[PDB]
Design a protein around this motif. Structure first.
Motif, mmCIF file in Angstrom:
data_model
loop_
_atom_site.group_PDB
_atom_site.id
_atom_site.type_symbol
_atom_site.label_atom_id
_atom_site.label_comp_id
_atom_site.label_asym_id
_atom_site.label_seq_id
_atom_site.Cartn_x
_atom_site.Cartn_y
_atom_site.Cartn_z
ATOM 1 N N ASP A 101 -23.746 24.496 -0.988
ATOM 2 C CA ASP A 101 -24.958 25.254 -0.732
ATOM 3 C C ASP A 101 -25.784 24.492 0.293
ATOM 4 O OD1 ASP A 101 -27.238 23.667 -2.076
ATOM 5 O OD2 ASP A 101 -25.758 23.799 -3.691
ATOM 6 N N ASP A 102 -26.944 25.043 0.636
ATOM 7 C CA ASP A 102 -27.711 24.499 1.742
ATOM 8 C C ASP A 102 -28.157 23.068 1.500
ATOM 9 O OD1 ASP A 102 -28.829 24.809 4.317
ATOM 10 O OD2 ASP A 102 -29.416 26.863 3.807
ATOM 11 N N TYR A 103 -28.086 22.582 0.264
ATOM 12 C CA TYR A 103 -28.436 21.192 0.003
ATOM 13 C C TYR A 103 -27.407 20.495 -0.878
ATOM 14 C CZ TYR A 103 -32.698 23.887 0.801
ATOM 15 O OH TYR A 103 -33.624 24.791 1.265
ATOM 16 N N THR A 104 -26.130 20.847 -0.764
ATOM 17 C CA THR A 104 -25.097 20.218 -1.582
ATOM 18 C C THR A 104 -23.769 20.351 -0.854
ATOM 19 O OG1 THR A 104 -26.231 20.565 -3.688
ATOM 20 C CG2 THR A 104 -23.840 20.309 -3.737
ATOM 21 N N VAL A 105 -23.336 19.277 -0.202
ATOM 22 C CA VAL A 105 -22.043 19.222 0.468
ATOM 23 C C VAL A 105 -21.134 18.333 -0.358
ATOM 24 C CG1 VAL A 105 -22.498 17.223 1.933
ATOM 25 C CG2 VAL A 105 -20.892 18.981 2.682
ATOM 26 N N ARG A 106 -20.023 18.894 -0.817
ATOM 27 C CA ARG A 106 -19.144 18.187 -1.728
ATOM 28 C C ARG A 106 -17.755 18.104 -1.125
ATOM 29 N NH1 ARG A 106 -17.749 20.323 -7.810
ATOM 30 N NH2 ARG A 106 -19.967 20.828 -7.588
ATOM 31 N N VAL A 107 -17.157 16.923 -1.237
ATOM 32 C CA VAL A 107 -15.816 16.652 -0.744
ATOM 33 C C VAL A 107 -14.947 16.320 -1.941
ATOM 34 C CG1 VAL A 107 -16.561 15.891 1.523
ATOM 35 C CG2 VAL A 107 -16.441 14.268 -0.359
ATOM 36 N N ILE A 108 -13.843 17.041 -2.097
ATOM 37 C CA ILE A 108 -13.006 16.863 -3.277
ATOM 38 C C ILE A 108 -11.915 15.833 -3.039
ATOM 39 C CG2 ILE A 108 -13.530 19.228 -3.895
ATOM 40 C CD1 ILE A 108 -10.231 19.431 -3.311
ATOM 41 N N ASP A 109 -11.323 15.830 -1.853
ATOM 42 C CA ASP A 109 -10.239 14.918 -1.534
ATOM 43 C C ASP A 109 -10.251 14.682 -0.036
ATOM 44 O OD1 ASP A 109 -7.976 13.448 -1.132
ATOM 45 O OD2 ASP A 109 -6.605 14.837 -2.133
ATOM 46 N N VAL A 110 -9.633 13.585 0.389
ATOM 47 C CA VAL A 110 -9.636 13.223 1.794
ATOM 48 C C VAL A 110 -8.231 12.799 2.186
ATOM 49 C CG1 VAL A 110 -11.022 12.138 3.556
ATOM 50 C CG2 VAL A 110 -11.869 12.263 1.209
ATOM 51 N N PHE A 111 -7.933 12.908 3.481
ATOM 52 C CA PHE A 111 -6.595 12.630 3.981
ATOM 53 C C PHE A 111 -6.679 11.828 5.269
ATOM 54 C CE2 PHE A 111 -4.710 14.963 7.639
ATOM 55 C CZ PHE A 111 -5.894 15.378 8.202
ATOM 56 N N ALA A 112 -5.704 10.948 5.464
ATOM 57 C CA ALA A 112 -5.734 9.978 6.547
ATOM 58 C C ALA A 112 -4.892 10.444 7.725
ATOM 59 C CB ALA A 112 -5.245 8.614 6.069
ATOM 60 N N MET A 113 -5.216 9.906 8.896
ATOM 61 C CA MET A 113 -4.612 10.305 10.148
ATOM 62 C C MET A 113 -4.042 9.073 10.829
ATOM 63 S SD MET A 113 -5.347 9.524 13.473
ATOM 64 C CE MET A 113 -6.922 8.781 13.064
ATOM 65 N N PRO A 114 -2.771 9.085 11.220
ATOM 66 C CA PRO A 114 -2.091 7.828 11.547
ATOM 67 C C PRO A 114 -2.799 7.085 12.666
ATOM 68 C CG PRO A 114 -0.883 9.683 12.423
ATOM 69 C CD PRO A 114 -1.937 10.255 11.527
ATOM 70 N N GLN A 115 -2.824 5.759 12.552
ATOM 71 C CA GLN A 115 -3.662 4.957 13.432
ATOM 72 C C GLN A 115 -3.106 4.962 14.848
ATOM 73 O OE1 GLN A 115 -4.442 2.442 15.362
ATOM 74 N NE2 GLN A 115 -6.611 2.150 14.868
#
Ligand SMILES: [Zn+2]
Lengths: 286, 70, 48, 284, 94, 88, 68, 189, 101, 51, 48
Positions: free
Chosen positions: D40-54
């Motif tokens: 919502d306009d005041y709640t940004v939620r991230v559930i999981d994250v993923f990596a990108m090769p260096q």
């Protein structure tokens, strides 16, 4: 041939997230994927995991689909992101290890020579079983048994890796079940250990009842060939102990006389000083 | 809370550390220490440490991101 | 500031010795034509 | 169109993955795109994250190579969900938690793609022991000139605790989006003393020969503490008591050498006896 | 067959159950130990012998009833001790 | 060190040539040393030159000759056996 | 960052110095090869990782170049 | 153009080694391939293909893909050794199809029923009673071994239809080792 | 074969390397004071498996770049220097080339 | 015991802030400007705090 | 020619120092060196 398997706290969270994500859209009650680790020695530190589509047919519990193409693609991307992870087995929930266990192990063995499957639950804590590890060794038999699937168990323990231990420390930061409150914690540990021993003994009792009633085959080969010997050294020395337990008195001398004396004298001195100070202050006030 | 706090303070004297020299002392809880680098710094001193082993010169460790006498 | 100890012909790579820090292999910025840069002259290598 | 005291919720697995990926490549710098839900306009939620090769010269606009960006987000939905890309790993090993001009140039494009996306900065070196340096940042709008002081607002609500840090002041500053970690009860059921509880090892008696040596090692110095206590008890004979009793250094006895020793001796000598006697009747 | 409490047996018993001489009994026990079916110890002046086992054998359903009973008694005792500790220590457990 | 390493280098390269180390009395002085050793790098350079000279078999053809206005101070090692041996 | 190899171990290994006088061991030899190597040869290394990228052509500093 | 994906059940049975249509039989299952679906992508370049074996309870050798090199490569190594399996074989393909992307694609299973099967009488309950509500399509190819016309297998399409269905058809090319033109021309698909 | 030689090529493009230093003392069973060739000194220990062997108050260890725990052994380098007084040649000489003595 | 949880707590925060440098001042310039001399590096024209 | 074969140990000059510590260090270094192999005999010439 593994002496032990160690799981990095990231993998358990991985499985829990998988179960939540599916079950929010699922009802099959089984999430199954393939993990990756580093078979550095007899020990195998599984350090990460991914997902893989999996559907199983309740009829006969023998029709299903694991997308080995998904296997290769996921592994390829994870290899691009890091080259130190090797596929070493799979994972799934549902402590009821379902029929398609050896089948899936066969399917996934075409990516490893010594694949080991560790089962991860998403629930119990009363006992200490967060996960158990299984291996698929098809050694035919001994004695006179026929062949079979014959899955096998590998000891497991939940491990840690620096820069992740920090993560878990922060993520918890409330219970902090370290040596904090040491005496109380020691008593609780003695209570918990007794409860765990009760539970293990009860499990043995249930198995013995079931085997004696004839519901399940007598595993003479290994199951009770060890239970008998275990029953054979329930220490019974009760004749010379009457004098071998004066080490209790040796402990008690210190732990009673010296500690009580020191604390009593210290408390007396503290009371003396506090009363003297307060009496002088009150007298001088007016 | 206090037990956790004592553990936390104790957890500052471990891990990798960098050696330096106790060049000179100032008001308690503070001192000036040399360094293996050779860029003599200014440091805060952990209270729990001793006081009779702080010779005019000596080998002491320092926190990497704090250079504190630990 | 930094000097140039070689300029690989037909290969845009150059080798420079800054002064006291260390040596390195450097690429020539587009703003400067290779001909304007020779062996032994002082180049204005940037940070980063 | 205005920011506030807004809360970003990062999942426990997300935090763990951030830290592991950061430490794996500490000498270099890493990059990892974030997936999440725009609550919502005041709640940004991230559930999981993923990596990108260096790859590339470092954290830059090269981490978004479409060939890799598309294929992961794709296969990922096949099993799980599509949570739209919301943020990025980034990582500054020894550089505090600042954002540099190149980083701003990068995040500019991500802001363009989104409208409120966030840039994380996880320090893999300083953050150890019991410290998490994960700070979240956003790009102040180019219309700085004259406006309501910052887009922060902070007029909507007073959530502002944990005021700005030190280094960010020195480097580019003035957002510092506040960060709050979500923890499902199950997610902490494991990751608990399931990480180290004991299992059934409380009913262990401890090496008895070792105990009878530790007890002597402790009591023998308790004797020295007793001698010191006598010496300090003869003190306070009305010469300069108020000042002297406080100015006397040397780890005053009944606070660091006669109390802690008694407390440790009691606990050890009692736990040993309790375990011994418990096993005297559990096993027959 | 001994009930795991009085495992110390007398040469008379070995002889009467083995039709061997009193003198030969010590050699028989020594041979048993050497092959490795028991791990007790041999003594003379007391006219007895001390055993302790590491070689278990097969069993039958009737012999499993004794094991089940022993386990049940053990579980009852363990529960009793756990409840005693929990109840008495309830002040300081939490 | 780099100077000397290279100097004896580019001698195998352009194989036919002869090297003359003028004013050898300076680069190599008798084996005095400083307890600090901070100002002892010249000794390292001289040892490097000595090593190069040792690693040389008459199969290769790159001669070396040098002059020393004062033979007194030259380290009595640069004259051992197979390093500068002929005297003129 | 130009450098050289000093004590090839093979216990397949390397021991790299740098122009920064920083003696660092290498876990695995560079993306190059175990034969194209020898006790001392200008080979480049990465700014932080310190791998062994492409080797270099022997080039002489002006100080020695201007002596023929 | 193509409202369909493709999965194939390439037989692997122990009986598959036989001269009945060509060299060693299966050598012909491979035969259509290069057209067994080469024709199917001879359609708009968005078709999908698959592969499933049917011996030893059957594995899966290809996951739905608008590619053919993989299916050919796996086909090269399909050594026949084992008793044919069905019903379960068809359900594995059904699940795989359910995991298809581009929901617009309809389903199709081309069953190369070669060696005899052991299916009971009323297998229909699971073999076909679903494809209607699941709107699935199944095609049957009888690699000879047409024991008494294999009415058992014909009953699968029989359960199909009910008004309209059968897919293309349950074509049982005659045991005459003519070729695959019978699996090339005959299939109007 | 090209793909094989490329897979390991890219895979090795992850290693970070250690710092070469000589241990000085033995503080504890898990704390060994270690120096570095550059000159700064540190305090570190074995990683999780090192045999904790002799590691006399002189030896070559390649500490990690983040934690700095000692990782591996390393024999002495003996850079061309006063460090090479060793010319034991065992048996290739006889009175066959004597000066008449 | 609240005293302890502070006399030992605040010490940690005030033990994790970057230390200070040691230098020699020379020729305090116009008020609010000085010329210190750090050990390894050169002379910096440092400011002066309000205390 | 005897079963030593290890003779060489070119002269002995490096043991010169300005304090007994460095000489003890060098002599035990050489003594361990000799202990390395079969009977080792140390040439001691080159003294002034
Ligand atoms: Zn950055």
């Amino acid at each position: 041939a593994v002496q032990k398997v160690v799981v990095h706290p990231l993998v358990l969270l991985s499985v829990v997230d998988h179960f939540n994500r599916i079950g929010k859209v699922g009802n099959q009650k089984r999430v199954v994927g393939v993990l990756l680790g580093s078979w550095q020695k007899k020990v195998l530190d599984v350090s990460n995991s991914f997902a893989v589509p999996f559907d199983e047919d309740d009829k006969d519990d023998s029709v299903w689909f694991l997308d080995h193409d998904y296997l290769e693609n996921m592994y390829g991307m994870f290899k691009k992101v890091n080259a130190r992870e090797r596929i070493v087995g799979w994972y799934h929930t549902g402590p009821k290890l379902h029929k398609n266990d050896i089948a899936i192990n066969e399917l996934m063995k075409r990516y490893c020579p010594n694949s080991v499957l560790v089962i991860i639950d998403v629930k119990p804590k009363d006992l200490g079983l967060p996960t158990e590890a299984y291996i698929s060794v098809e050694e035919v038999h001994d004695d006179g048994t026929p062949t079979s699937k014959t899955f096998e168990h590998v000891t497991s323990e939940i491990g840690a890796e620096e820069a992740e231990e920090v993560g878990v420390e922060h993520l918890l930061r409330d219970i902090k079940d370290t040596t904090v409150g040491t005496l109380s914690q020691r008593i609780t540990n003695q209570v918990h250990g007794l409860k765990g021993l009760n539970s293990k003994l009860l499990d043995i009792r249930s198995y013995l009842e079931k085997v004696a009633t004839g519901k399940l085959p007598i595993n003479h080969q290994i199951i009770y060939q060890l239970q008998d010997v275990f029953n054979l050294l329930p220490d019974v020395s009760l004749q010379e102990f009457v004098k071998a337990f004066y080490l209790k008195t040796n402990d008690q001398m210190v732990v009673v006389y010296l500690a009580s004396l020191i604390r009593s004298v210290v408390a007396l001195h503290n009371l003396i000083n506090n009363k003297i100070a307060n009496r002088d202050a009150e007298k001088k006030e007016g | 809370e206090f037990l956790h706090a004592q553990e936390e303070v104790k957890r500052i004297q471990s891990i990798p550390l960098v050696i330096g020299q106790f060049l000179e002392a100032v008001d308690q809880n503070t001192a000036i220490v040399g360094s293996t680098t050779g860029s003599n710094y200014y440091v805060r001193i952990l209270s729990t440490i001793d006081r009779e082993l702080l010779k005019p010169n000596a080998s002491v460790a320092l926190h990497k991101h704090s250079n504190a006498l630990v | 500031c930094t000097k140039i100890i070689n300029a690989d012909s037909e290969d845009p790579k150059y080798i420079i010795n800054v002064k006291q820090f260390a040596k390195f292999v450097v690429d020539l910025s587009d703003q400067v034509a290779p001909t304007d840069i020779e062996e032994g002259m002082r180049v204005g290598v940037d940070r980063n | 169109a205005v920011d506030t005291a807004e809360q970003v919720y990062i999942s426990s697995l997300a935090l763990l993955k951030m830290l592991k990926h950061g430490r794996a490549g500490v000498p270099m710098e890493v990059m990892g795109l974030m997936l999440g839900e725009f609550v919502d306009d005041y709640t940004v939620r991230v559930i999981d994250v993923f990596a990108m090769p260096q790859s590339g010269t470092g954290v830059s606009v090269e981490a978004v190579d479409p060939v890799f960006q598309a294929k992961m987000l794709d296969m990922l939905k096949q099993t799980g969900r599509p949570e739209m890309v919301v943020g990025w790993y980034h990582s500054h090993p020894g550089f505090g938690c600042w954002l540099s001009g190149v980083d701003i140039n990068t995040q500019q494009s991500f802001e363009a793609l989104s409208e409120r996306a966030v840039a994380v900065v996880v320090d893999p070196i300083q953050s150890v022991k019991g410290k998490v340096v994960i700070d979240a940042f956003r790009l102040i709008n180019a219309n700085m000139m004259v406006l309501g002081h910052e887009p922060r607002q902070t007029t909507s609500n007073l959530g502002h605790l944990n005021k700005p840090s030190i280094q960010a002041l020195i480097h580019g500053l003035n957002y510092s989006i506040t960060i709050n970690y979500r923890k499902n009860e199950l997610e902490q059921k494991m990751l608990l003393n399931l990480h180290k509880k004991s299992w059934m090892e409380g009913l262990t008696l401890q090496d008895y020969s070792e105990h009878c040596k530790h007890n002597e090692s402790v009591v023998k110095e308790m004797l020295e503490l007793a001698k010191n206590y006598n010496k300090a008890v003869e003190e306070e004979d009305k010469m300069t008591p108020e000042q002297l009793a406080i100015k006397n250094v040397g780890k005053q006895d009944p606070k660091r050498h006669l109390e802690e020793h008694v407390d440790v001796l009691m606990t050890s000598n009692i736990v040993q006896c309790l375990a011994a006697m418990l096993d005297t009747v559990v096993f027959k | 067959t001994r009930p795991a409490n009085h495992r110390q047996l007398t040469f008379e018993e070995i002889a009467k159950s083995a039709k061997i001489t009193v003198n030969e009994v010590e050699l028989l026990v020594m041979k048993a130990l050497s092959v490795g079916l028991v791990k007790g110890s041999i003594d003379e002046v007391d006219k007895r012998v001390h055993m302790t086992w590491v070689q278990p054998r097969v069993l039958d359903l009737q012999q499993i009833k004794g094991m089940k009973d022993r386990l049940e008694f053990w579980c009852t005792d363990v529960k009793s001790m756990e409840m005693l500790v929990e109840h008495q220590a309830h002040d300081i457990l939490t | 060190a780099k100077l000397v390493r290279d100097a004896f280098a580019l001698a195998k390269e352009k194989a036919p040539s002869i090297i003359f180390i003028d004013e050898l009395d300076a680069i190599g002085t008798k084996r005095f040393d400083s307890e600090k050793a901070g100002d002892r790098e010249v000794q390292r350079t001289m040892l490097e030159l000595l090593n190069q000279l040792d690693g040389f078999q008459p199969n290769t053809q790159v001669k070396v000759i040098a002059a020393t206005n004062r033979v007194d101070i030259l380290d009595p090692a640069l004259l051992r056996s197979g390093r500068l041996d002929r005297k003129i | 960052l130009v450098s050289n190899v000093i004590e090839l171990l093979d216990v397949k290994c390397a021991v790299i110095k740098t122009s920064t006088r920083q003696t660092y061991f290498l876990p695995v030899i560079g993306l190059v090869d175990a034969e194209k190597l020898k006790p001392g040869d200008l080979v480049g290394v990465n700014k932080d990782s310190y791998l062994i990228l492409e080797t270099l052509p022997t080039e002489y500093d002006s100080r020695v170049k201007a002596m023929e | 153009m193509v409202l369909e994906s493709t999965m194939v059940c390439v037989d692997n049975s122990e009986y598959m080694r036989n001269g009945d249509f060509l060299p060693t039989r299966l050598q012909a299952q491979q035969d259509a391939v290069n057209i067994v679906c080469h024709s199917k992508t001879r359609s708009n370049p968005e078709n999908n293909v698959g592969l499933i074996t049917l011996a030893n309870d059957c594995e899966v050798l290809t996951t739905l893909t608008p590619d053919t090199g993989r299916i050919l490569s796996k086909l090269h190594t399909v050594q026949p050794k084992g008793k044919i399996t069905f019903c379960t074989g068809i359900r594995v393909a059904h699940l795989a199809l359910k995991h298809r992307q581009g929901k617009n694609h309809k389903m199709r299973i081309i069953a190369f029923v070669g060696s005899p099967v052991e299916d009971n009488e009323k297998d229909l309950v699971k073999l076909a009673k679903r494809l209607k509500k699941e709107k699935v399509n199944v095609d049957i190819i009888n690699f000879g071994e047409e024991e008494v016309n294999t009415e058992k297998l014909t009953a699968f399409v029989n359960t199909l239809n009910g008004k309209d269905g059968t897919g293309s058809h349950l074509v049982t090319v005659p045991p005459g080792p003519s070729l695959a033109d019978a699996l090339i021309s005959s299939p109007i698909l | 074969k090209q793909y094989e030689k490329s897979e390991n090529d890219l895979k090795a493009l992850q290693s970070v390397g250690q710092i070469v230093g000589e241990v000085l003392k033995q503080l504890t069973e898990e704390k060994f004071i270690v120096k570095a060739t550059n000159g700064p000194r540190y305090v570190v220990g074995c990683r999780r498996q090192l045999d904790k062997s002799k590691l006399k108050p002189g030896t070559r260890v390649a500490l990690d770049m983040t934690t700095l725990t000692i990782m591996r052994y390393l024999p002495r380098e003996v850079d061309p220097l006063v460090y090479n007084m060793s010319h034991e040649d065992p048996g290739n000489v006889s009175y066959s080339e004597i000066g008449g003595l | 015991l609240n005293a302890k949880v502070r006399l030992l707590r605040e010490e940690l925060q005030l033990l994790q802030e970057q230390g200070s440098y040691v230098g020699e001042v020379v020729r305090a310039m116009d008020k609010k400007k000085v010329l210190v001399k750090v050990h390894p590096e050169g002379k910096f024209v440092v400011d002066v705090d309000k205390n | 020619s005897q079963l030593d074969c290890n003779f060489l140990k070119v002269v002995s000059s490096s043991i010169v120092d300005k304090y007994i510590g460095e000489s003890a260090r060098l002599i035990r270094e050489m003594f361990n060196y000799a202990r390395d192999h079969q009977p080792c005999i140390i040439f001691m010439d080159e003294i002034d």
